[PDB]
């Protein structure tokens, strides 16, 4: 066998066809961004939540 899969049936691991090494693949960082603000009638400063 060459490559693996997870429960969600997506590529999880691969095999390098030059050194017979198995490499785990993980997606690089991502997420949601929310903005915490008071009213614009009060201030213009904000905070950010990742």
């Amino acid at each position: 066998q060459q490559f693996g899969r997870d429960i969600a049936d997506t590529t999880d691991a691969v095999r390098d066809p030059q050194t017979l090494e198995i490499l785990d693949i993980t997606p690089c960082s991502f997420g949601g961004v929310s903005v915490i603000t008071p009213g614009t009638n009060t201030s213009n400063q904000v905070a950010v939540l990742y």
């Binding site: 997870d6 429960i7 969600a8 997506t10 997606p27 949601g32």
Partner: peptide
Amino acid sequence: KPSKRSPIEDLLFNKVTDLICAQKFKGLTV
């Protein structure tokens, strides 16, 4: 106990119970 729970609350919390990461990688978060 470090949770400050009662002898029955602990039993209830014990009696109720990679998939999370796999679903997160599809865009579904909790």
